[PDB]
Design a protein around this ligand. Sequence first.
Ligand SMILES: [Cl-]
Ligand SMILES: [Cl-]
Lengths: 203, 197, 200
Amino acid sequence: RCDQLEERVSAAEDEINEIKREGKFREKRIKRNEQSLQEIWDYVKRPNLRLIGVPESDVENGTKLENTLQDIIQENFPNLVQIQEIQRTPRATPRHIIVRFTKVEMKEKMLRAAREKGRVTLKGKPIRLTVDLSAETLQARREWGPIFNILKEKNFQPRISYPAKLSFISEGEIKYFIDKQMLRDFVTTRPALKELLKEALNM
Amino acid sequence: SRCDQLEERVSAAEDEINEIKREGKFREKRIKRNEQSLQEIWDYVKRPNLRLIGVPEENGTKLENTLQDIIQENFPVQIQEIQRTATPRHIIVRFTKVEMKEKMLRAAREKGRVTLKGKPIRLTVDLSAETLQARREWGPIFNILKEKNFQPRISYPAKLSFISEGEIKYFIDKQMLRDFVTTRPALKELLKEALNM
Amino acid sequence: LRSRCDQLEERVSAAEDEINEIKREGKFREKRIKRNEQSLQEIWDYVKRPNLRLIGVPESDVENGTKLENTLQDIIQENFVQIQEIQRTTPRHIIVRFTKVEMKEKMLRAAREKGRVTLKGKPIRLTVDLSAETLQARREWGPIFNILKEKNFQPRISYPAKLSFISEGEIKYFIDKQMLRDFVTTRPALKELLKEALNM
Ligand SMILES: [Cl-]
Ligand SMILES: [Cl-]
């Protein structure tokens, strides 16, 4: 009676380890899917562009928006179009506008022009243009913040790029980092950066 | 003694299990999220798409010319690409502007019977398998609201809406509706069986 | 003592039930994951379908958008158009997204018939851009494909990873190995031929 309960417990302890082991593999697969989904939303949203702070208009149509876009380009980037779809999205502020361009080149060309100008205005009113990314990647850039700040202050010229890379000057050369772990390996090689981003990287 | 050495292993095992249960409901929440994402990214990608069902049965020019005959025979347009996928397969037609896709779809609906050379065909919207199933599951509830004068309506992706207290209410899924009618006596006993509550 | 064992009996017994339930629930999640993995495979194939992959193109520090496009034309002229985009990923692969999938197919068939693709003399490669899963599925047709080729079936692999050869004066398509297993069941001469490759 005491031995039967013992062997029963033993068998159970085995099932549990087996269940845990399987859970680990399962985990590793759910994580790969989450990353696959991230990469794909960024890939799809590649020719997209967010227009932020554009005055709403009583009864807007798809045609109205396209004209607005050209007004923006006219007012900001003269020297500089085909749209597959342009529309609002989907709190009391003007909704964003997604502009899916037919070509990715176009999306890039307008961001480059907007970054060189600094101030982008629509009828004097400063509007804002920015890439369209997946919530995941979007939250990845926001997590660079703390580190970005520290590098910013200490004149490292930090810079976040697609998808959510972090780049800055170290030895007269730009160093790109895909995640925090990659950066962790780099800081351990330079004493200066190591003690400067120690807490940030949570080492 | 021995019974105590055992009573300890079992307490630990109870803990291990509990731990495992919690990781279960977590991985499951994430699974649903991934499922709901795919559902969204499929719908998105198929935004400028239309399906041609029943077309007699290969190059890109003939299919485009075929499309023209359809528009000319039923709807008195920029095509990015058009191609095939006991019945001739479907023909996916990807337009240049989602708007142009929406125009021809709405024209196909308001006309009713769309035909090619006299033979009946169809121009369905291109949606994810998940969103489609969702739309036909509102069916039962939609009928009930239609009967009891609520003016029901299904929209993209698969949202149900109707008049409740003089206000339009939108519901992205049944679950959201279940949480809604639960506090509405009239609706609750009216859609109880429909919502499997 | 005696009452304690009596209280353990129930505890361990109940513990055994939880274990079983977990095994089942885990078994359902497993199914749901595969559906998601298979779905990710399919959605990637869809997106990457109008894409063409360039392998073995020397890098360049002054390389830009027009640089690549030019290089693509050089390849066309040396060995043999509307481009949605072209960009890099040992030289990085080049992903050429065409306007029409048809364009891609013309290119691929031309590279297959010519057999060898070179740039400025040095050899390169032109493969499809698909999901890892599909790329493997394609490679898994490998052995069987070669057997069909030796036996003059004139096999061919198409999107996604579909095998097609000529049998009974007609082209037969096979989406996977199991579909082929069902096909060869009623055809002894062919079964014998692929018995070991299909692992039957
Ligand atoms: Cl998953
Ligand atoms: Cl699990």
